[PDB]
Symmetry: D3
Subunit: 133 residues, 6 copies
């Protein structure tokens, strides 16, 4: 059908601020289903760097990796109609109220959640976190 | 400008237990219930009249089938700028913050209907609440 | 044991915009709506029949007055052990966790009524939904 | 980096019991309370100062009367980009997802005030918390 | 009528955990109204010790005062029918789900909220926090 | 002081979309996740081990079939007095305020499992997370 899969990361600030269920709940409410899920008490920097490889040239690259390994993260593969972009809109940004980041986050770095932004990004990110493909 | 508008709560809302969730969003925006009917299964005729403008579209029959595949609630809501405001509340499955934006992800199963103009509002209210 | 029970949503619920809140608590416990009527103002007779057992109590008339001071919704709910479970959901204004426990604080204005026995449930359903 | 901004919770929030709902939205966005005062009734000259840029408008007097019709809370919030972020949270009655977009439907009774610039922020904070 | 007033403290853990609105919301929802309210970025130990004077002989007395001045608190005077005990039940305890402490707290000391437990306690506590009687 | 306890989120939670709702209640009580696994379908021998004390009961096989009818999540939670506090959170279908009391109404489809003793806790954690 229009069925898709996408990769979401719940970031360490979410655990810090006790917002894990709140975030997963918003995705659950829009009728997306968990296909795979993995809890990392601390992610290997290796995985983080791969995941953010497209960002390796940026000023914020290392500070961001630092944060991403500063506490637990959950990686989830979601599935549903048009999953990649719909879950991207749910994530939104810190400027737009009504989205996850819009309602709950206020920082350029500590922003609670990652979602794949394209078909190619999803395929690649899912592979990084669930290599057992 | 105080108006009235017609809302339908669709069978997917009952299936997924989103009924009160949906009504609550409209209630919290301060719109009031003027009349309301619960249909365990809506008469197919009523659904056909309701969606008449669409009779030529390819989705007409499938949509009718779905609209009759479970209960629905028909509600007349009152309030300032009600037709326009409740339409925004309804929203669409793309933009978060709305009923459809937060809770739906289908082109057919989208939880709620709301009139979109003064004319369709008058018409739909007469279809579901002829007692006027 | 699958049962049906009668619920009234009282005028204070409309006044304080707690309608969907109340219905949502029953919906989330997995009870289903079997029938439902919205009354902009309930006929005083219906209210008198409904509260007959209380006709001799000092609060009878004041209570009737309140019950007619705004809209109410009459609902028939279905589900396993529905009469007993929805009574617990209704609760009382003392113990938190229930509808009254969380949302009410009056001996008269207490948001919701729920049948309390198999007999009163049958009776009340006939008062509000005679079509049987 | 850090900014501070002035928020007013308006009397319609108390009347409609939405005070915690509004404060909660700003809290969930990680803004912190620096100062706060509850006014069972705000002195009229504070209200008039606060809206002084509006002194020539037709709605001026009526809005002041409304603002003095019940309790208000004045809060200084602190956080990154506080002024603009809280402005967007307030939003407007046409924009679902925001405070006014979800809970308000009036030109005047719109639940919340938030400063809209650095200068207005600085000035408004000194009106409500002149002890600084 | 049956009208009463009672004193509530929102404790420093509430600000720490971002649960201030959540707590005040539960009281607001049961139809109690704020009569006076005061924000303390940090309360004078003097006030805390008075407030907990009946506890001056206990092992936990000083550790508790320590915590009560470890961050902001809000003191509120609420009003409504039977306010003292109804708001006491709302507060509940860490063992009873459905109450504030029952749903949200898990510690003998860091327990989010105080509510007066009698007519005499209320009168005295209100006097401590809003001396302007 | 600290304890750890085993929680199972049952297939009815996935079917009814209450997974976040349940995890949220335990999160709001300040319990932390130590370990967690999602099982699209749990191997039947894990389920049977997990319920082994129940092997002679009449409901044994049927309950196992239910537990394998959809996804489940196994979580190790850590916090002060975790075992007993999470047990009370789970509660039962007769007790409003708890997970089962608010959201469940069945003898078997009751949303959540939580360990009920130190020994059962230790044993159940080793069934679902034997890597320790
Ligand atoms: O100035 C920045 C920009 C981004 N990031 C982090 C947060 C962000 O989530 C991630 C990827 O950056 P992006 O693609 O700009 O944001 P998004 O995650 O919204 O795609 O890098 C920073 O730490 N600082
Ligand atoms: O391709 C489609 C388009 C629409 N519909 C249904 C869903 C929609 O709610 C109804 C009316 O369609 P619309 O007027 O395009 O949508 P709306 O209800 O958003 O005005 O028809 C379909 O089943 N398939
Ligand atoms: O002193 C009273 C007692 C009761 N009632 C009203 C509220 C109540 O909902 C209704 C029926 O009374 P009940 O059977 O004692 O309460 P419940 O509805 O909890 O069974 O009468 C009063 O107005 N005053
Ligand atoms: O026609 C109007 C316009 C505004 N106001 C009130 C409500 C508003 O909150 C306040 C200030 O007006 P504004 O700056 O236009 O609105 P905002 O508060 O969104 O900046 O004056 C009215 O009563 N009538
Ligand atoms: O062992 C204890 C007991 C109490 N307290 C603190 C928390 C409590 O809120 C306050 C007053 O004690 P209480 O009267 O036993 O509890 P409550 O506040 O529930 O009345 O003292 C502790 O720090 N440790
Ligand atoms: O008659 C029964 C009793 C129990 N069970 C299932 C549901 C229950 O969660 C599990 C274990 O039973 P229990 O220990 O009595 O319930 P709990 O999980 O509350 O300890 O077995 C049934 O299917 N039928
Ligand atoms: Mg990106
Ligand atoms: Mg249309
Ligand atoms: Mg009775
Ligand atoms: Mg302005
Ligand atoms: Mg005490
Ligand atoms: Mg057991």
């Amino acid at each position: 059908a229009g069925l898709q899969r996408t990769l979401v990361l719940i970031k360490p600030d979410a655990f810090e601020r006790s917002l894990v269920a709140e975030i997963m709940g918003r995705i659950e409410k829009k009728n997306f289903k968990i296909v795979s899920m993995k809890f990392w008490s601390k992610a290997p920097r290796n995985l983080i760097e791969q995941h953010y490889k497209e960002h390796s040239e940026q000023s914020y690259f290392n500070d961001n990796c630092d944060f991403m390994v500063s506490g637990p993260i959950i990686s989830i593969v979601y599935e549903g109609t048009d999953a990649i972009s719909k879950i991207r809109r749910l994530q939104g940004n810190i400027l737009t109220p009504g989205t996850i980041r819009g309602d709950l986050a206020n920082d350029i770095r500590e922003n609670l959640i990652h979602a794949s932004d394209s078909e190619d990004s999803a395929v690649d990110e899912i592979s990084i976190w669930f290599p057992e493909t």
